[PDB]
């Protein structure tokens, strides 16, 4: 983490635009790792919600440490003082060296956010998205300097999940990409490198594998519970595909696979699943609603 | 295991035709679980190497006793004459298997259940020649059979309810966790895993990401104990290729089954994975 941090003298102040679960988790690990954080969202209620969740989580971790009760709360306040909030994007990004967008998955809203960002940030600022749902080319399409754009695809809960996929568009410069690799490593992650291809690595291989399982079930070849057992037991996976999809969220999996089906209409693997569609249309989204493939 | 074994009063004698690695491993766990076994192959040398490998595993009276339950026979007709269950583990050639089953049919008891362990063909293609298709099914084990707990128990369109119930009990009697599948290409495991591995190869081939970053992403992102290139090397590249080739030829309109250059090259070059010290990676 230090080898990386000390090789990015240029990157001291980070702005995260969007204050939901991912934005708040990215803010937490960025602060814990020693950078200054500005978390931005026009939604004040969301900003308050995030800072309470971060504060909780940081406090929680400190409790595991060895040390005096002062040593611990000292640790929490050092971390939290690196995090500031702002309800105006242009103000928030004015002194940022790296900006990470974690907003709603809507391409016009994101492009609008990036136009605001580039109007206000520093000339050599690096801009990034955490999206799972769009190509970096399509997010960056209006920017003046595409060579300082890339992707930082974390996984929820960000403080717990080690992996980080670091993405380059066709236009990302080598220097910007290398900086992004060092930032992922500085914040404690195991980075993997991917081009701007739908699904990067994890989702591109996992979501179609899940849909293939659903498809097997829908043809009537085997039951959901036998599928899951065969994969845990035959391949060592800790969750079968249906449990996995419930865990990720059905709405989450459908929405990604829907964007692929539409952009890549000739690719058989990306067809929607009558059954996924019907479960999401019913609000049976998986664990987070208590009910998807299975009940919880 | 006992709950199963004592509900199969009719199944005492098991014949296994083909004494390669899977037939020999099925012989071993079937002997260990209390059945009588006849191991049959027309290649006397193979039969010899199979009994030496088996005794080698089982050592690791108990060795003598376990062995006394396994007899060999280089004649498939006479080997199955007294068998209640016959399990075919022969080479992956459909004419050879149909000829074997033509032989077994002519000799076996009329109530005998007939099964294949094949990964490469549809049950209904293996059985296409058979007069009573209703006592036919699939017992798909995994190498090494003595260690691998899963067994996919497969029915055709013709397998009777009674035959299939017996097959599930057999799997359970021999210490396996059974799962049921219809006669579909790849059953459950290979149908999901082999295309996920090819998807991984294709991603590397397109130049999107490196082999080691793809494997690291799947271990860390999904908790998989091996990433897809590690797993393929473990299973064997020749094995993964041969099954996928079968699918690409039989289902020519399915994009997911299209062959891979890197794979073809690595197998055409004899780089078959862990078992040869080189596949995707070196060992």
């Amino acid at each position: 983490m230090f080898t990386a941090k000390c090789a990015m003298q240029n990157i001291r102040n980070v702005a995260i635009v969007g204050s939901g679960q991912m934005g708040s988790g990215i803010a937490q690990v960025t602060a814990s790792s020693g950078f200054n954080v500005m978390l931005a969202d026009v939604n004040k209620k969301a900003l308050d919600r995030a800072m309470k969740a971060i504060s909780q989580s940081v406090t929680h971790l400190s409790k595991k440490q060895k040390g005096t009760d002062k040593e611990k709360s000292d640790f929490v306040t050092l971390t939290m003082s690196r995090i500031k909030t702002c309800n105006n994007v242009s103000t928030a990004v004015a002194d940022a060296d790296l900006i990470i967008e974690a907003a709603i998955e809507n391409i016009d809203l994101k492009r609008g956010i990036f136009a605001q960002i580039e109007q206000s940030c520093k000339k050599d600022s690096i801009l990034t998205t955490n999206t799972s749902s769009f190509l970096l080319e399509d997010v960056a399409k209006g920017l003046q300097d595409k060579t300082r754009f890339g992707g930082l695809h974390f996984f929820n809960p960000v403080p717990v999940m080690k992996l980080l996929e670091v993405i380059r568009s066709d236009d990302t410069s080598d220097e910007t990409y290398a900086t992004l690799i060092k930032f992922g490593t500085a914040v404690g992650k195991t980075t993997v490198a991917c081009k701007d291809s739908p699904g990067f690595i994890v989702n591109r291989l996992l979501i179609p594998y899940f849909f293939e399982a659903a498809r097997m079930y829908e043809r009537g070849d085997a039951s959901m519970t036998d599928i899951d057992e065969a994969m845990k037991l035959g391949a060592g996976h800790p969750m079968g595909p249906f449990e996995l999809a419930d865990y990720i969220g059905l709405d989450t999996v459908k929405f990604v696979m829907d964007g692929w089906a539409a952009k890549y209409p000739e690719v058989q693997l990306f067809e929607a699943s009558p059954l996924v569609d019907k479960l999401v249309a019913e609000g049976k989204l998986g664990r987070k609603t208590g009910d998807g493939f299975y009940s919880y």
Side-chain angles (χ1 to χ4, degrees), chain A:
Chain A
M1 284 169 82
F2 175 77
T3 298
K5 187 140 193 351
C6 79
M8 284 179 314
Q9 301 291 327
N10 63 311
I11 304 311
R12 294 180 181 173
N13 293 330
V14 181
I16 295 156
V17 174
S19 181
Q21 169 172 53
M22 309 288 297
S24 64
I26 292 164
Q28 177 177 334
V29 297
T30 303
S32 292
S33 304
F35 288 93
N36 293 317
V37 171
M38 172 77 53
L39 184 50
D41 200 301
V42 296
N43 178 350
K44 284 182 71 165
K45 276 174 212 273
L47 289 175
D48 290 347
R49 284 190 284 278
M51 291 301 285
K52 281 159 188 219
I54 294 162
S55 181
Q56 269 155 21
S57 175
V58 173
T59 294
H60 183 44
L61 296 163
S62 73
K63 292 179 179 170
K64 292 164 167 194
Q65 301 162 26
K66 299 274 170 300
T68 51
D69 292 343
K70 289 174 210 180
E71 274 168 2
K72 284 155 160 131
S73 53
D74 283 355
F75 162 89
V76 186
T77 53
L78 204 72
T79 300
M80 300 305 300
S81 85
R82 295 174 191 139
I83 309 169
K84 294 183 177 166
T85 64
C86 184
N87 73 326
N88 175 313
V89 175
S90 313
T91 300
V93 304
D95 195 36
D97 307 305
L98 168 67
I99 290 114
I100 309 175
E101 171 277 305
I104 182 178
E105 287 284 51
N106 177 299
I107 184 67
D108 298 310
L109 294 174
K110 290 192 199 284
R111 298 191 177 144
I113 287 169
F114 276 109
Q116 292 178 1
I117 290 165
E118 69 162 5
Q119 181 176 340
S120 284
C121 63
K122 290 185 298 183
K123 299 181 169 179
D124 281 356
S125 291
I126 289 167
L127 274 55
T128 64
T129 180
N130 89 316
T131 192
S132 300
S133 304
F134 295 105
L135 294 171
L136 279 40
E137 280 177 345
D138 296 350
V139 180
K141 165 171 177 229
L143 291 177
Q144 189 171 353
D145 183 355
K146 289 162 176 89
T147 74
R148 276 159 192 86
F149 188 82
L152 291 170
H153 181 68
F154 292 91
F155 295 81
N156 182 56
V158 175
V160 181
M161 304 290 303
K162 204 75 182 32
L163 184 68
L164 168 64
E165 302 170 290
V166 182
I167 316 305
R168 67 190 309 161
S169 67
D170 187 39
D171 281 318
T172 315
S173 76
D174 288 353
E175 294 73 26
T176 289
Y177 199 57
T179 294
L180 296 182
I181 298 283
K182 285 177 183 71
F183 177 72
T185 307
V187 300
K189 295 320 186 190
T190 296
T191 61
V192 293
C194 195
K195 293 185 284 126
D196 188 3
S197 43
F200 311 136
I201 299 167
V202 175
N203 283 339
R204 184 45 173 282
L205 291 182
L206 287 178
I207 294 176
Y209 151 70
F210 155 67
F211 273 78
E212 284 289 297
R215 290 168 192 158
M216 180 179 287
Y217 166 76
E218 283 182 278
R219 301 181 281 265
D221 294 338
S223 61
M224 289 182 17
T225 53
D226 268 3
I227 293 160
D228 278 352
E229 181 78 338
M231 301 310 107
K232 296 192 290 182
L233 203 183
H237 295 174
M239 289 178 75
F242 293 98
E243 291 176 359
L244 176 65
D246 284 351
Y247 176 70
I248 296 168
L250 299 197
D251 57 0
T252 293
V253 305
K254 175 195 158 33
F255 180 89
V256 174
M257 170 64 88
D258 285 343
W260 304 335
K263 193 165 182 76
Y264 310 116
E266 308 311 313
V267 175
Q268 290 169 351
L269 186 65
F270 291 157
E271 178 183 341
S273 151
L275 171 66
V276 176
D277 278 359
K278 302 195 146 71
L279 293 174
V280 177
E282 304 180 357
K284 279 149 199 267
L285 302 186
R287 268 171 204 231
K288 67 195 209 175
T289 66
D291 196 64
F293 290 118
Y294 305 116
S295 312
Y296 305 78

